DNA sequence: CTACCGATAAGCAGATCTCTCGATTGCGTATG
DNA sequence: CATACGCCTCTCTGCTTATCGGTAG
RNA sequence: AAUCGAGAG
């Protein structure tokens, strides 16, 4: 009943329908649980590049979209958190945000999660094979922008479902 | 005879999504021909300028394409529009020129203007004033009085 | 082998149209009646869940108790609005009753009359809008217990 | 009859009204029909017919 | 037509439970053949159903009392049967001289029950069926008053008879909690059969015993083989 | 309780004590906006979740 | 409600108000004057509870709206009753603002700088200004001071609205927020505590009596004190009646209208209308229409309704002290029987106690008194069967069916089984079109019995024809004449609309409650079926809905329009809804036979001759159905080839995939594993593990993981690959893959088991 | 009286021109999200049903709901979505400036 | 000294899917 | 003895309210 | 129409 009006807004943060904000991004990513199937099944991506290719056609989904700005943003960031190493978080800096915080997460190809990162390049640390890090790294940053909660998707709805059906399968309380 | 720009919020039929204007005038404004509008109230009669709105705010005028919003529940758009009434106006006090086609004793059977009916009552070219008008009748009409 | 006494004769069950309760104008309740099933609270949270606003829309408002009713845009009112009594050869027009005052009162056709043969002229600014019934029998109840509710128009 | 299909919803005023012109006169009554026909509601538009011959010359 | 268990308690005798038999020996097949009965439906032969296999009718009984306006010496208003006013013969057609219905009538929506001559109105009323299930009557039971008084007749009860065959959709258990709605009327011809000749009447899925874990089911088919064997 | 301090008295009616949520809307002469769904619901109004989220327009070819 | 009447208007907000005693006399058909409510020869009773001005009633023509009973809309009227009672929804609020009040200086007993500083507050509130509501309270720093306090608060105030008016802050209506609605109602809820907790008056120095309730319809006020009393002289529990209360806040009200005003409106009141205290007290009752107070027939007996008899029971108790007050006058000159005059005084105030309890009857039942009590106007919308949750959130609905489910593993996964009786009877009206009229005028023709046909036909007028009692030379008339030229000017624009039957080409909703989660709700195809009258659904879409073939029933809701049509086909449709939002785990895929199936078909020792293999395949797919790709079946070489060719069953896997999966793409090169250890196969087995590549199985078997309630199965990767709907296709596909094995190699349990 | 609906309508059309975005400043999805796709293909189907123009050959078709996903395929559809945001403001994407999938 | 108030255990108001059947409906006393 | 008209006792949260004293005018 | 009773998933 509380959570039956908060919806994506078409700025992909989320806000009940009188307004107010309750977050700026659905779980800190944008990731729509559906879509979040085979996101850091990166073996998985790789054995089907080719087949994934025909449906994230970047000839078709390039032109009407910005392919430089946020990968640049990205790159930049990722050297900045990667250079401040290890500290206790109330120590490092604040110069550098999470790039679909300032980028469009729909309009600026690129601009992806922390985590999504770090765990794609952990990944493509293998070197081990056609299929180069440069093609696999673009469909996986396309698979990303097509991995996001369309606007407007009834996230308070689907996450009091989410929250109250497995209910029923039921020294702390 | 006085021209009066009114604007009006007429909805439009998914039938003329090809002809705006049209549309608009032979869904809205032939209806309104030679009948007393609660507007101005004389016979409407011509609907110069009708110009169409456009529910987007950043439209340059002059364009040929104009968009028509649509009512979330069925196919047919509703919008703002303007047009120039052009109606004639004859009210209480006024002269008025008409003839004579049939006449009776007790309540005249003639057509002012050479169409529009009319009657002579019993207490009551030529200039004669007007009483009253007559619009909640069948047609147009307005009875005699010569008194002076 | 039992054959138990749950036949699908006595369980299924299908209305198009049919009877109406009088004050909701909404499908009965029953089978034997001929009336509807309940598409509930929880089966609307449903509705929405999916986002398909117009199937909500469907099984709550348009095959339920759509009505055209009208509503005086001049005093914001559902149920104050009546339809005129004709005279001879006129048309009934549909006016309002508490934006109208007395033509006897204040000392040609902005004049209608009601039944009991009372004369006015006033509110006849009403426009027709698509609400249930329900909402005409909540502002009956409302208004008995000395609440008014002003609906606003989107065309003024 | 007169449902939304033929009725507008509102015909509120936005100016009052200005006459016009003699010149004004005998400019429509020969450029109608030509802008218009040049349907069943024809049986109540043949008026105008009587309206123009009233301002022209004899009904 | 019901059928004593094979596989019966020793209780069934002792409590005379013979007079009143719930069901039927079934030749049951744990067999996965069909696809249509896995979660928890059952398959009924469809040649077995169509030779007397758990047919049933249903009684319904419907009251006529005509006292419903009539009250404590107030006139008789209404008199079974047809006056001399106008009414069409398709009513006499489905109904007897005195205005009942005869017994055993095929009757439906629409049909007169029974008609009367009202006195006040001057015309014939009728009754319809209130049921949109074919029926037969069974029995019309004039009622009259236990009191040294006597009066007219205006209360019958009417006893109404419908063909309840088993269709697909309907309850069929076993005696073990094994119930499942028959999905289909399997025609014999696409049955299973064995070398013996016989398509088994009812076709459950063996996957309903793992997790309900009836052993009972298994021994109750094997006692009743070896039995009627 | 946790839901006193939202602009849409109709969710509140609905939910529960409908009365006291009629009372402290009436007092206040709050103007219920009809933008929560409970609210469209009450009215009869599309919802603005999902398929409601934005409206449709149809560009004409003629003046 | 109908496509082809559009509505021009259309509700933007609502906003509640008090109905004013004046608008509803000057609203009002009429009056209410005698209880009885209807006489003999069944007739309605001018001035009763049924008069014709209420409204149409029984083929008795409105003598207000002068419509019959189908046209009638109602019209509403009202009782005047003598003794203003008290509204029973705001008894508190009256009970606040009474109390805390001074009747001496007629003012609250709180200073008024006090009352300023949060009358200031609330202005400020209203437009959202939530800091500087707070920052007022820096001017702090004896009646030119306080009158210095003021006008520095107020030109402090009228700046900070003007400088956010100016900035944007702002608008004219005023911005009101959840933490705007948290500040205000915190704000006006410590201004009523510090307002209710003040002894003498402080704004003149005076003590004013205290006041008590013994619950609603309930008042009485009480007496000073010994030492009070002398306070009173040199600063200068009796009942008190319902007028009283009103004419003491009348004046207060008046006083603190500024406080009033920025109390009672949460939003900057742009009408500026006063704030009269009379808004408490109910002067007039208002009487639902006839149409909303109807009896009903249940056989023979009648009920009078339960509004009636509480409306006429308040009026009774109304003519009681009208006509009481008649016999008050007879005593009025002859001023010698004052005790007599004083027990018809006692017996008029125990009748104003009586009405009052009798309207707070008809609005609350349990704001009355006295130990089956008649529901009251609270208690018809307050609670799960009230109005709002039972008439308004969730509604009975046409076109929508219901019946028992069984399983029909021969339609495909998107589809359901429905039924010939629900074909003839659930209905959808079709506008006629030139790309229609071949099969509209052939359902016209059929009619109502032969599907696929028509039960109705609307005219272009709107007017309905019924083709259920026709002849078939009548409905071929009608057909012929179907689509034709409107002559009526009118309705230029519109065409017939023909409520044909449901065909295979709709969609459905299908619904098992309780809907615990939203993917127990979806859309299917509907495929019709002459078989008994039972809706027939696949076995994946069981796991969706929860639902088993036990005697479940699900309700069938036809949607009829296509903006409902084309929401439940894209949104809502059972294909697009493989996964739950729950975790992002799949919830559909085969179940239990045809898992026990695979473990089978897909085991190693299983292999099928040419014409085995060849029969499997076709039988799974069906060209002529749409399941392959290549326009023509395409085959797979034999495992084996000498003595004889023999196939595989992992072969008949992938030959099933290399059908369905579209041509010139990759087959799906899968990694994964199943429920099955390798050590139950025998020493060397490797089938724990299954190698998928280019489209072929080629180690360990096919199993639960792989199709159902698993993850990261074969079909789990055919979604993520080609989407839902080839995922879907699969899950069809080995469905009557695995059905048709199954008959032919029989699965079964026993005691050697 | 004619003059005071003037100042409502300069009022309300300068409201709504505030609103708007300059058909250049809008910074939402390109993509058309399945919940237009839904009502886009819903509408036009309506519109269709209701004897609107078609510019595509039918093939042969009865379904006003396919004839509207053809069209679509074609992308010949005369409708503009219009993306309201959390305060309001307008963002009039047309048919062919979205991609699909 | 006492009022202003800031905080100390108790009384009450309101909570705790859909469906199909069937049966029955408070009494006392006053006039004809 | 029919007919007709009214009086009558086995949960939990969260806000109604405490008795008294601390302490600056 | 409510109350009570029997059941279905
Ligand atoms: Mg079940
Ligand atoms: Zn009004
Ligand atoms: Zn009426
Ligand atoms: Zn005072």
Redesign the interface.
């Given at each position: 009943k509380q959570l039956?009006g908060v919806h994506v807004s078409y700025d992909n943060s989320i806000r009940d329908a009188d307004g107010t904000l309750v977050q700026f991004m659905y779980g800190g990513d944008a990731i729509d649980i559906t879509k979040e199937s085979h996101m850091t099944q990166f073996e998985f991506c790789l054995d089907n590049y080719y087949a994934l290719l025909k449906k994230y056609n970047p000839s078709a989904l390039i032109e009407h979209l910005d392919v430089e700005s946020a990968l640049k943003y990205s790159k930049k960031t990722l050297k900045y958190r990667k250079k401040h190493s290890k500290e206790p978080h109330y120590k490092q800096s604040v110069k550098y945000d999470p790039v679909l915080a300032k980028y469009n997460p729909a309009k600026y190809l690129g601009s992806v999660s922390e985590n999504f990162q770090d765990k794609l390049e952990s990944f493509l640390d293998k070197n081990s094979k056609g299929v180069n890090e440069k093609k696999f790294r673009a469909l996986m940053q396309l698979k990303y922008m097509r991995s996001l909660i369309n606007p407007?998707?009834?996230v308070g709805?689907?996450a009091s479902?989410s929250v109250g059906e497995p209910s029923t399968q039921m020294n702390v309380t | 005879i006085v021209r009066v720009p009114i604007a009006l919020?007429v909805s439009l039929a998914p039938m003329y999504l090809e002809n705006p204007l049209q549309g608009v005038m032979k869904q809205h404004l032939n209806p309104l021909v030679m009948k007393?509008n609660?507007k101005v109230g004389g016979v409407v009669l011509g609907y110069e300028g009708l110009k169409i709105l456009d529910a987007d705010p950043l439209s340059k005028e002059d364009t040929s394409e104009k968009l028509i919003k649509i009512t979330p529940?069925t196919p047919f758009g509703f919008t703002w529009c303007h047009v120039n009434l052009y109606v004639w106006q004859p009210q209480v006090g006024d002269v008025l020129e008409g003839y004579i086609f049939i006449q009776s004793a007790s309540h005249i059977g003639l057509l002012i203007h050479d169409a529009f009916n009319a009657s002579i009552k019993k207490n009551n070219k030529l200039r004669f004033t007007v009483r009253?008008?007559h619009?909640?009748?069948?047609v147009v009409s307005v009875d005699g009085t010569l008194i002076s | 082998?039992?054959?138990?006494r749950?036949?699908?004769?006595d369980?299924?069950?299908?209305?198009?149209?049919?009877p109406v309760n009088?004050?909701?104008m909404?499908?009965?309740?029953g089978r034997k009646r001929h009336?509807?099933?309940?598409?509930?609270?929880?089966?609307?949270?449903?509705?929405?869940?999916?986002?398909?606003?117009?199937?909500?829309?469907?099984?709550?408002?348009?095959?339920?108790?759509?009505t055209?009713?009208?509503?005086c845009?001049e005093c914001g009112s559902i149920?104050?609005?009546?339809?005129s009594?004709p005279?001879?050869?006129?048309?009934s027009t549909v006016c309002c009753?508490?934006c109208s005052?007395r033509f006897e009162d204040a000392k040609?056709?902005?004049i209608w009359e009601?039944?009991?043969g009372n004369k006015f002229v006033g509110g006849n600014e009403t426009?027709?809008?698509?609400?249930?019934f329900?909402?005409?029998?909540?502002d009956?109840?409302?208004?008995?217990?000395?609440?008014?509710?002003?609906?606003?128009?989107?065309?003024? | 009859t007169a449902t939304?299909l033929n009725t507008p919803?509102?015909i509120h005023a936005t100016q009052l009204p200005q006459h016009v012109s003699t010149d004004e006169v005998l400019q429509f009554l020969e450029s109608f029909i030509d802008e218009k026909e040049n349907t069943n509601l024809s049986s109540s538009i043949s008026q105008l017919k009587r309206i123009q011959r009233d301002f022209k010359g004899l009904p | 037509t019901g059928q004593t268990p094979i596989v019966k308690a020793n209780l069934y005798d002792d409590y005379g439970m013979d007079n009143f038999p719930?069901?039927?020996?079934?030749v049951?097949a744990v067999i996965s053949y069909t696809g249509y009965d896995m979660d928890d439906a059952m398959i009924i032969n469809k040649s077995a159903d169509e030779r007397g296999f758990?047919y049933?009718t249903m009684y319904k009984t419907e009251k006529v009392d005509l006292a419903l306006n009539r009250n404590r010496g107030d006139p008789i208003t209404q008199h079974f049967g047809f006056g001399n006013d106008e009414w069409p013969k398709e009513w006499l057609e489905k109904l007897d001289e005195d205005g009942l219905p005869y017994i055993g009538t095929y009757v439906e929506e629409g049909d007169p029950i029974c008609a009367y001559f009202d006195d006040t109105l001057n015309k014939t009323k009728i009754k319809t069926y209130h049921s949109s299930?074919p029926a037969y009557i069974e029995e019309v039971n004039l009622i009259g008053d236990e009191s040294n008084k006597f009066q007219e007749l205006q209360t019958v009860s009417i006893k109404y008879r419908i063909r309840?065959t088993?269709?697909?959709?309907?309850?069929?258990?076993?005696?073990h909690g094994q119930?499942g709605?028959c999905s289909r009327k399997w025609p014999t011809i696409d049955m299973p059969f064995s070398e013996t000749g016989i398509q088994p009447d009812?076709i459950i899925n063996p996957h309903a015993f793992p997790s309900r874990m009836t052993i009972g089911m298994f021994v109750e088919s094997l006692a009743g083989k070896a039995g009627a064997l | 309780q946790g839901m006193e301090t939202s602009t849409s008295s109709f969710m509140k009616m609905s939910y529960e004590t409908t009365c006291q949520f009629?009372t402290k809307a009436?007092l206040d002469n709050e103007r219920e906006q009809l933008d929560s769904?409970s609210a469209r619901?009450?009215?009869?109004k599309?919802?603005?979740?999902?398929?409601?989220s934005f409206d449709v327009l149809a560009k004409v070819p003629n003046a | 409600?109908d496509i082809s009447?559009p509505?021009?208007?259309?509700?933007?907000?609502?906003?509640?108000?008090?109905?004013?005693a004046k608008?509803i006399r000057?609203?009002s058909?009429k009056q209410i004057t005698n209880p009885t409510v209807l006489d003999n020869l069944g007739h309605p009773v001018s001035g009763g509870l049924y008069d014709?001005?209420l409204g149409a009633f029984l083929r008795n023509?409105?003598?207000?709206?002068?419509?019959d009973e189908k046209?009638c809309?109602?019209?509403?009227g009202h009782i005047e009753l003598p003794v203003p009672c008290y509204?029973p929804?705001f008894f508190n609020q009256l009970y606040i603002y009474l109390r805390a009040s001074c009747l001496f200086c007629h003012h609250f007993r709180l200073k008024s700088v006090e009352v300023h500083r949060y009358a200031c507050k609330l202005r400020l509130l209203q437009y959202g200004l939530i800091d500087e509501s707070y920052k007022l309270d820096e001017i702090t720093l004896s009646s030119t001071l306080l009158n210095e306090l003021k006008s520095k608060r107020s030109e402090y105030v009228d700046m900070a609205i003007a400088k956010a008016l100016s900035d944007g802050r702002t608008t004219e209506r005023g911005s009101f927020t959840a933490t705007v609605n948290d500040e205000r109602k915190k704000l006006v809820h410590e201004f009523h505590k510090k307002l209710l907790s003040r002894g003498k008056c402080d704004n003149c120095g005076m003590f004013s009596p205290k006041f008590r309730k013994d619950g609603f319809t309930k008042i009485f006020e009480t007496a000073l004190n010994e030492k009070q009393i002398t306070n009173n002289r040199v600063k200068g529990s009796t009942y008190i009646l319902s007028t009283e209360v009103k004419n003491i806040l009348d004046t207060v009200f008046r006083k603190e209208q500024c406080v009033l005003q920025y109390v009672f409106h949460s939003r900057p009141n742009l009408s500026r209308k006063l704030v009269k205290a009379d808004s408490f007290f109910?002067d007039v009752?208002?009487?639902?229409?006839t149409?909303?107070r109807?009896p009903?027939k249940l056989g023979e007996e009648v009920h009078e309704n339960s509004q009636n008899q509480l409306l006429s029971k308040v009026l009774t108790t109304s003519l009681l002290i009208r006509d009481l007050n008649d016999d008050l006058s007879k005593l009025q000159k002859d001023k010698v029987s004052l005790e007599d005059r004083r027990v018809i005084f006692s017996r008029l105030m125990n009748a104003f106690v009586t009405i009052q309890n009798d309207v707070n009857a008809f609005?609350d039942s349990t704001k009355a008194q006295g130990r089956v009590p008649i529901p009251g106007?609270?208690q018809?919308?307050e609670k799960k069967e009230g109005?709002?949750?039972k008439?308004?959130?969730?509604?009975?609905?046409?076109?929508?069916?219901?019946?028992?489910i069984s399983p029909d593993p021969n339609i495909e996964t998107n589809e359901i089984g429905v039924?010939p009786?629900?074909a003839v009877?659930?209905?959808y009206p079709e506008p006629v079109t030139a790309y229609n009229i071949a099969e509209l005028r052939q359902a016209v023709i059929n009619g109502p019995d032969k599907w696929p046909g028509a039960?109705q036909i609307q005219n272009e007028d709107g007017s309905l024809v019924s083709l259920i009692g026709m002849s078939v030379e009548q409905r071929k008339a009608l057909a012929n004449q179907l689509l034709t030229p409107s002559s009526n000017v009118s309705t230029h624009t519109l065409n017939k609309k023909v409520y044909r039957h449901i065909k295979n080409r709709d969609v459905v909703?299908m619904?098992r409650?309780?809907?615990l989660?939203?993917a127990?709700?979806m859309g299917h195809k509907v495929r019709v079926l002459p078989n008994?009258?039972?809706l027939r659904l696949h076995y994946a879409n069981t796991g969706a809905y929860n639902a088993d073939f036990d005697?479940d029933?699900m309700?069938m809701?036809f949607?009829?329009?296509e903006?409902?049509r084309?929401?439940?086909l894209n949104?809502?449709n059972t294909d697009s809804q493989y996964l739950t939002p729950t975790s992002g785990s799949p919830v559909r895929g085969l179940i239990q036979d045809h898992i026990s199936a695979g473990v089978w078909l897909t085991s190693k020792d299983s292999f099928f001759t040419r014409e085995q293999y060849q029969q499997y395949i076709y039988g799974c797919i069906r060209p002529e159905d749409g399941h392959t790709t290549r326009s023509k079946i395409v085959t797979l070489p034999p495992t084996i080839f000498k003595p004889y060719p023999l196939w595989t069953g992992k072969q008949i896997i992938t030959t099933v995939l290399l059908n369905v999966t579209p041509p010139d793409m990759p087959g799906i090169n899968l990694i994964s594993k199943n429920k099955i250890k390798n050590e139950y196969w025998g020493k060397g087995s490797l089938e724990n593990e299954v190698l998928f590549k280019d489209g072929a199985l080629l180690c360990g078997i096919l199993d639960k993981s792989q199709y159902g309630a698993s993850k990261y199965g074969i079909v789990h990767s055919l979604h993520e690959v080609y989407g839902p709907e080839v995922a879907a296709k699969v899950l069809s596909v080995l469905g009557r893959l695995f059905t048709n094995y199954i008959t032919a190699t029989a699965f079964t349990c026993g005691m050697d088991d | 009286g004619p003059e005071d609906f003037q100042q409502?309508e300069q009022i309300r059309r300068k409201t709504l021109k505030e609103k708007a975005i300059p058909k250049d400043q809008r910074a939402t999805t390109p993509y058309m999200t399945?919940?237009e796709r839904?009502?886009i293909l819903?509408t036009r189907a309506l519109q269709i049903s209701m004897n609107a123009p078609v510019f595509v050959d039918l093939e042969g078709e009865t379904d006003p709901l396919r004839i509207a996903m053809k069209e679509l395929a074609e992308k010949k559809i005369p409708l503009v979505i219009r993306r309201y945001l959390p305060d309001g403001s307008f963002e009039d994407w047309s048919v062919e400036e979205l991609i699909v999938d």
């Open positions: 039956e407007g998707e009834a709805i689907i479902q | 919020y007393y609660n529940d009253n008008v619009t909640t009748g069948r | 082998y039992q054959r138990l749950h036949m699908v004769n369980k299924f069950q299908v209305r198009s149209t049919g009088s004050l909701t909404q499908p009965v309740k009336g509807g099933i309940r598409v509930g609270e929880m089966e609307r949270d449903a509705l929405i869940g999916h986002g398909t606003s117009f199937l909500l829309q469907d099984r709550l408002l348009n095959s339920s108790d759509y055209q009713a009208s509503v845009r149920l104050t609005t009546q339809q009594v005279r001879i050869g006129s048309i009753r508490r005052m040609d056709s902005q009601d039944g009991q426009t027709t809008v698509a609400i249930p329900v909402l005409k029998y909540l009956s109840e409302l208004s008995a217990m000395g609440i008014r509710l002003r609906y606003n128009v989107e065309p003024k | 939304t919803v509102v | 719930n069901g039927f020996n079934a049951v758990g049933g299930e309840r088993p269709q697909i959709g309907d309850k069929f258990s076993s005696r119930k709605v009812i | 009629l009436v769904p619901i009450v009215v009869g599309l919802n603005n979740v999902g398929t409601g | 409600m009447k509505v021009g208007s259309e509700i933007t907000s609502v906003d509640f108000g008090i109905l004013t608008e000057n609203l058909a014709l001005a023509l409105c003598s207000t709206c002068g419509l046209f809309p109602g019209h509403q509204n929804l109910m009752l208002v009487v639902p229409p149409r909303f109807l009903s609005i106007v609270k018809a919308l109005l709002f949750r008439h308004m959130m969730g509604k009975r609905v046409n076109y929508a069916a219901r019946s028992v039924p009786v629900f009877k659930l209905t039960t909703l619904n409650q309780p809907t989660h939203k127990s709700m008994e009258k039972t005697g029933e309700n809701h949607p009829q329009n903006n409902a084309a929401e439940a949104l809502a | 409502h399945k919940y839904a009502r819903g």
